[PDB]
């Protein structure tokens, strides 16, 4: 589960696509299987924006890992505030539901849910906004994820999505 490679992310305050960020990251592999088309790289010295789901505050946190997998999966577009993010069906988007920020699959969203969108104006850095969903069908596609320390979410095209955690198990 992940987002598409053209998704724009914050890397230490600069903007780039997540695929560009993956390609720019040195080949320090935590996991590599070319046949399964599955890669995890360690990241050093980079941060991104996230939301603390307990305090509700935006926090800048270290990026620990970046992942790339080529998948054949059902894809959904989340549209909110003139921005959009394309995610796999198995990947969680963050929503404000009943006063709490939680992770939900694109197939399980409610009409009363709101997505969390980055803001360029006003005293608040985020807004909770109505949204639409579009089913893009099944695609064979490179998808990417980052592990964000502590908060396990990140903004893709200004929309908050759940991050993966790679547990460095062994």
Automatic annotation (TrEMBL):
Domain Hint: 1-119
Protein name listed in UniProt: DNA polymerase subunit
Protein source organism: Aeromonas phage Aes123
């Amino acid at each position: 589960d992940a987002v598409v490679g053209d998704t724009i992310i914050d890397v230490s305050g600069k903007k780039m696509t997540i695929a560009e960020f993956y390609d720019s990251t040195p080949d320090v592999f935590m996991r590599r299987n070319d046949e399964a088309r599955d890669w995890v790289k360690r990241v050093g010295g980079k941060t991104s924006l996230s939301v603390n789901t307990y305090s509700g505050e935006v926090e800048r946190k270290n990026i620990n890992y970046i992942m790339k997998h080529t998948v054949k999966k059902r894809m959904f577009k989340i549209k909110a505030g003139g921005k959009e993010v394309i995610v796999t069906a198995d990947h969680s988007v963050m929503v404000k539901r009943d006063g709490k920020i939680i992770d939900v699959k694109p197939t399980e969203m409610k009409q009363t849910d709101r997505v969390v969108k980055w803001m360029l104006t006003g005293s608040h850095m985020i807004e909770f906004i109505e949204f639409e969903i579009e089913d893009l069908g099944v695609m064979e596609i490179d998808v990417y994820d980052i592990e964000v320390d502590g908060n396990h979410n990140f903004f893709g095209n200004d929309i908050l999505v759940h991050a993966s955690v790679y547990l460095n198990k062994l």
